[PDB]
Enzyme design. Structure first.
Site, PDB file in Angstrom:
ATOM      1  N   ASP A 127       0.823  -1.209   0.000  1.00 28.67           N
ATOM      2  CA  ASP A 127       0.000   0.000   0.000  1.00 28.67           C
ATOM      3  C   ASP A 127       0.860   1.264   0.000  1.00 28.67           C
ATOM      4  O   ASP A 127       1.290   1.741   1.052  1.00 28.67           O
ATOM      5  CB  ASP A 127      -0.932   0.007   1.209  1.00 28.67           C
ATOM      6  CG  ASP A 127      -2.089   0.975   1.048  1.00 28.67           C
ATOM      7  OD1 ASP A 127      -1.904   2.031   0.410  1.00 28.67           O
ATOM      8  OD2 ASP A 127      -3.197   0.654   1.522  1.00 28.67           O
ATOM      9  N   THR A 128       1.005   1.865  -1.174  1.00 28.89           N
ATOM     10  CA  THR A 128       1.885   3.007  -1.339  1.00 28.89           C
ATOM     11  C   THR A 128       1.254   4.270  -0.766  1.00 28.89           C
ATOM     12  O   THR A 128       1.932   5.276  -0.580  1.00 28.89           O
ATOM     13  CB  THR A 128       2.222   3.250  -2.821  1.00 28.89           C
ATOM     14  OG1 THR A 128       1.013   3.436  -3.570  1.00 28.89           O
ATOM     15  CG2 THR A 128       3.006   2.075  -3.386  1.00 28.89           C
ATOM     16  N   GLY A 129      -0.037   4.198  -0.466  1.00 30.18           N
ATOM     17  CA  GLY A 129      -0.746   5.316   0.153  1.00 30.18           C
ATOM     18  C   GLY A 129      -0.696   5.295   1.671  1.00 30.18           C
ATOM     19  O   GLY A 129      -1.350   6.102   2.333  1.00 30.18           O
TER      20      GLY A 129
HETATM   21  C1  LIG Z   1      -0.511   9.405   6.689  1.00 32.24           C
HETATM   22  O1  LIG Z   1      -1.625   8.652   7.173  1.00 32.24           O
HETATM   23  C2  LIG Z   1      -1.656   7.426   6.582  1.00 32.24           C
HETATM   24  O2  LIG Z   1      -0.715   7.044   5.882  1.00 32.24           O
HETATM   25  N1  LIG Z   1      -2.719   6.636   6.749  1.00 32.24           N
HETATM   26  C3  LIG Z   1      -2.837   5.386   5.994  1.00 32.24           C
HETATM   27  C4  LIG Z   1      -4.047   5.492   5.048  1.00 32.24           C
HETATM   28  O3  LIG Z   1      -5.188   5.400   5.497  1.00 32.24           O
HETATM   29  N2  LIG Z   1      -3.743   6.153   3.908  1.00 32.24           N
HETATM   30  N3  LIG Z   1      -4.592   6.257   3.044  1.00 32.24           N
HETATM   31  C5  LIG Z   1      -4.563   5.369   1.874  1.00 32.24           C
HETATM   32  C6  LIG Z   1      -5.801   4.473   1.858  1.00 32.24           C
HETATM   33  C7  LIG Z   1      -5.572   3.300   2.814  1.00 32.24           C
HETATM   34  C8  LIG Z   1      -6.253   2.041   2.275  1.00 32.24           C
HETATM   35  O4  LIG Z   1      -5.619   1.675   1.049  1.00 32.24           O
HETATM   36  C9  LIG Z   1      -6.099   1.008   3.203  1.00 32.24           C
HETATM   37  C10 LIG Z   1      -6.877  -0.142   3.094  1.00 32.24           C
HETATM   38  C11 LIG Z   1      -7.911  -0.377   3.995  1.00 32.24           C
HETATM   39  C12 LIG Z   1      -8.803  -1.424   3.780  1.00 32.24           C
HETATM   40  C13 LIG Z   1      -8.707  -2.199   2.629  1.00 32.24           C
HETATM   41  C14 LIG Z   1      -7.634  -2.004   1.767  1.00 32.24           C
HETATM   42  C15 LIG Z   1      -6.753  -0.946   1.968  1.00 32.24           C
HETATM   43  C16 LIG Z   1      -9.510  -3.328   2.464  1.00 32.24           C
HETATM   44  C17 LIG Z   1     -10.847  -3.056   2.757  1.00 32.24           C
HETATM   45  C18 LIG Z   1     -11.663  -2.274   1.937  1.00 32.24           C
HETATM   46  C19 LIG Z   1     -11.183  -1.633   0.796  1.00 32.24           C
HETATM   47  N4  LIG Z   1     -10.897  -0.211   1.111  1.00 32.24           N
HETATM   48  C20 LIG Z   1     -10.114   0.550   0.236  1.00 32.24           C
HETATM   49  O5  LIG Z   1      -9.700   0.022  -0.796  1.00 32.24           O
HETATM   50  C21 LIG Z   1      -9.654   1.810   0.631  1.00 32.24           C
HETATM   51  C22 LIG Z   1      -9.963   2.834  -0.467  1.00 32.24           C
HETATM   52  C23 LIG Z   1     -11.429   2.714  -0.892  1.00 32.24           C
HETATM   53  C24 LIG Z   1      -9.691   4.244   0.063  1.00 32.24           C
HETATM   54  N5  LIG Z   1      -8.190   1.736   0.875  1.00 32.24           N
HETATM   55  C25 LIG Z   1      -7.614   2.273   2.032  1.00 32.24           C
HETATM   56  O6  LIG Z   1      -8.349   2.741   2.901  1.00 32.24           O
HETATM   57  C26 LIG Z   1      -5.166   7.461   2.921  1.00 32.24           C
HETATM   58  C27 LIG Z   1      -5.147   8.288   4.038  1.00 32.24           C
HETATM   59  C28 LIG Z   1      -4.054   9.113   4.287  1.00 32.24           C
HETATM   60  C29 LIG Z   1      -4.099  10.030   5.334  1.00 32.24           C
HETATM   61  C30 LIG Z   1      -5.267  10.176   6.076  1.00 32.24           C
HETATM   62  C31 LIG Z   1      -5.331  11.020   7.103  1.00 32.24           C
HETATM   63  C32 LIG Z   1      -4.901  12.281   6.988  1.00 32.24           C
HETATM   64  S1  LIG Z   1      -5.404  13.068   8.356  1.00 32.24           S
HETATM   65  C33 LIG Z   1      -6.299  11.821   8.967  1.00 32.24           C
HETATM   66  C34 LIG Z   1      -6.232  10.814   8.086  1.00 32.24           C
HETATM   67  C35 LIG Z   1      -6.381   9.407   5.769  1.00 32.24           C
HETATM   68  C36 LIG Z   1      -6.335   8.497   4.724  1.00 32.24           C
HETATM   69  C37 LIG Z   1      -2.912   4.211   6.982  1.00 32.24           C
HETATM   70  C38 LIG Z   1      -3.217   2.907   6.238  1.00 32.24           C
HETATM   71  C39 LIG Z   1      -1.552   4.088   7.678  1.00 32.24           C
HETATM   72  C40 LIG Z   1      -3.985   4.463   8.043  1.00 32.24           C
END
Ligand SMILES: COC(=O)N[C@H](C(=O)NN(CCC[C@@]1(O)Cc2ccc(cc2)C/C=C\CNC(=O)[C@H](C(C)C)NC1=O)Cc1ccc([C@H]2C=S=CC2)cc1)C(C)(C)C
Ligand SMILES: [Cl-]
Ligand SMILES: [Cl-]
Ligand SMILES: [Cl-]
Lengths: 99, 99
Positions: free
Chosen positions: A25-27
């Site tokens: 997960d690059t995000g």
């Molecule tokens: C710097 O903070 C982070 O790196 N947070 C990370 C994170 O949430 N980063 N974000 C990328 C999305 C994470 C994830 O790929 C993570 C993920 C979660 C669940 C799943 C796969 C991947 C499987 C279940 C359902 C499918 N859900 C998704 O595919 C969703 C997408 C529809 C958005 N995927 C995701 O939510 C996006 C994200 C980034 C930042 C923020 C925040 C910024 S301020 C408060 C939150 C929120 C979301 C993490 C994993 C460490 C909590």
């Protein structure tokens, strides 16, 4: 390997002697795994995702194999929807995005 | 390009006449953007991440331009804390993971 994205980039990791599946997960800044036991002391972290904030346990300097590539680094443990390998460990195994 | 993962993999996208910054996310099924206007039909969707679920509007067949690469895909719009490009569009610009 070169991994395409028509499917979820799910790989096998090994941590504490056990195999698990995790999502590359690059995000994600950080790596966060579902509840499990790890050795040593832990610190608190609050991490934010799409749906809000969760509390996790932070373990440092933990050996972890990721499709057979050795890393040692910070692993968070708590109530995540799936095991996610973030950039902190993706950088250790020489991952880049290419197009 | 080849994109390093020392930092967050942020790119400019063009969508609905607008330039926006977004995070290339291999772990995301879908593409989700903060509140904006898009033309045509939509339907509601709940998407889940760390923290829980948020409700979004689903628009299909939306043209988007990522790092100069044209694609067309479903775009979700709602109260996401950051703009994420997910696999549904990453595939279309030929984006792979490599290590
Ligand atoms: C710097 O903070 C982070 O790196 N947070 C990370 C994170 O949430 N980063 N974000 C990328 C999305 C994470 C994830 O790929 C993570 C993920 C979660 C669940 C799943 C796969 C991947 C499987 C279940 C359902 C499918 N859900 C998704 O595919 C969703 C997408 C529809 C958005 N995927 C995701 O939510 C996006 C994200 C980034 C930042 C923020 C925040 C910024 S301020 C408060 C939150 C929120 C979301 C993490 C994993 C460490 C909590
Ligand atoms: Cl680390
Ligand atoms: Cl799509
Ligand atoms: Cl392909």
């Amino acid at each position: 390997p070169q991994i395409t994205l028509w499917q979820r980039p799910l790989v096998t990791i090994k941590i504490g002697g056990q195999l698990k599946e995790a999502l590359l997960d690059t995000g994600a800044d950080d790596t966060v795994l579902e509840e499990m036991s790890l050795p040593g002391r832990w610190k608190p972290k609050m991490i934010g995702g799409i749906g809000g904030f969760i509390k996790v346990r932070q373990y440092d300097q933990i050996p972890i194999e990721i499709c057979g590539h050795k890393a040692i680094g910070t692993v968070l443990v708590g109530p995540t929807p799936t095991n996610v390998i973030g950039r902190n460990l993706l950088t250790q195994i020489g991952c880049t995005l290419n197009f």
